[PDB]
UniProtKB/TrEMBL annotation:
The chain holds residues 1 to 479 of 919 of the full protein. Keywords: Calcium, Metal-binding. Ca(2+) 3 binds at residues 82, 85. GO terms for molecular function: metal ion binding. The gene is ul37. Ca(2+) 7 binds at residue 358. It comes from Suid herpesvirus 1. GO terms for biological process: virion assembly. Ca(2+) 1 binds at residues 81, 178. This is UL37. Ca(2+) 4 binds at residues 311, 313. Ca(2+) 2 binds at residues 82, 84.
Amino acid sequence: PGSMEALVRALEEADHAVATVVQSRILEFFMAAGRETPAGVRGLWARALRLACRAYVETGTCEAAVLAENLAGLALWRLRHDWDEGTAPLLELLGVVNGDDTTAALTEAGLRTSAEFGPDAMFRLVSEWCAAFDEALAGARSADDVLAAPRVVPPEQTARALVQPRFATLYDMDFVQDGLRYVAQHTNWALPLALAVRQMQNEGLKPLTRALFALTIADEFFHDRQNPTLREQFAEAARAVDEAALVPVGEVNATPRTAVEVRVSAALAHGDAYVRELRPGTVARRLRTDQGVLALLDPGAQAVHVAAAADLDHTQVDATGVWEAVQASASPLQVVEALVTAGFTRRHCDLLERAVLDRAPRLTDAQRAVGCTAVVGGVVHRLLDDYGPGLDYVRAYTDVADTLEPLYGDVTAALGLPEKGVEHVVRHCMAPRPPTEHVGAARAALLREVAAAERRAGLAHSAAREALNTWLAFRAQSRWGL
Ligand SMILES: [Ca+2]
Ligand SMILES: [Ca+2]
Ligand SMILES: [Cl-]
Ligand SMILES: [Cl-]
Ligand SMILES: [Cl-]
Ligand code: NA
Ligand code: NA
Ligand code: NA
Ligand code: NA
Ligand code: NA
Ligand code: NA
Ligand code: NA
Ligand code: NA
Ligand code: NA
Ligand code: NA
Ligand code: NA
Ligand code: NA
Ligand code: NI
């Protein structure tokens, strides 16, 4: 049902004394849209290659030459590979493509094995690419792993080897773009966790700050799964909390009021990060949310006490520095480090956005800084899991970008931003940066092989050239907007 299937069939309808039928069929494959799977290509490869090689032998046409010599690349181009199964199935298909019969058939037909989209080339580059893929995924696997070794990795660094220029001819191929999606989905999530761990373990931070960070980690990354080292680290910090930060029992509204306060109070009352509720009759003090609590927090991370930061009638946290650092950020690492370090975790952004926007249009400048940071932050957090150098992130970004106007168009003025101000900040640090110049390089490579076949055939223009150009142009526009 795919491209190769239709081709094998079509070529298996004989008609070789009429080079013109053979050409139409091949030209159709050149422009086909049918996706294929590794097992599918693997089952059809030898027959497909043999039929293409035989097509050139009997018609001597330029289309047949190009097909046979570049079949490996053309077959891989529309490949649908299930990345949950890793590289093995791809390597297994490459083993078939690269087998002795492929060389024997091309040689006997008097054609090359060495085209830029040929079997030798595809075996070498895709093998290398798969090795890079495997290396990219050999980083932290679990939240448990990251907590133990909280390495901070720039999101851009992870898929770096996979989109380097030597792999330019593979870039627009479906399995590559699918693989980029897979790598991003399995690596990016760890950055905010690693960043929060660094704050929890930061000996220059106050005990209360460190305790609250531990709770954000338990809530965002562990839920109900107990990690003993997280457990110990929260307990140590909880035990050292300045008692001045807590509201005295017996004062009005002293009981935890919001879900946040109950969750925090329960963990503090038990010295246990995984306790999130208070059974009735159990006394537990809540953290103060008055302006005086700010002196009990770290100046750069007050928002980590999100209940205080959200209590806008009583307390104004200082978000000017974090908002400044967020604005100045020109990469995912920079902006996410600015957010998380200041206590603007995913959940806190969600809460502070709600709290500030519920007061619009009449916001103070200090409230604007909190709201701006929380609005941009929520958008950054949403995009981060998808972040990468390929088509999937372009699509994920566009989806997010389309929601900004209906969400924020009416509060941007109140937030003190110009028209499109949210998108203008988000684009500065999170805009997709795919190396789409690879698409052009890939086309250049294919046309060099077309031009080689044109010369062997003794022409200066071929239908092959026009079909392939039409195909590549459709892909370039329809996928990348080029
Ligand atoms: Ca699967
Ligand atoms: Ca997302
Ligand atoms: Cl919290
Ligand atoms: Cl998407
Ligand atoms: Cl603009
Ligand atoms: Na998959
Ligand atoms: Na498979
Ligand atoms: Na197998
Ligand atoms: Na080969
Ligand atoms: Na022979
Ligand atoms: Na690091
Ligand atoms: Na300390
Ligand atoms: Na009291
Ligand atoms: Na901090
Ligand atoms: Na105040
Ligand atoms: Na995310
Ligand atoms: Na997605
Ligand atoms: Ni997964």
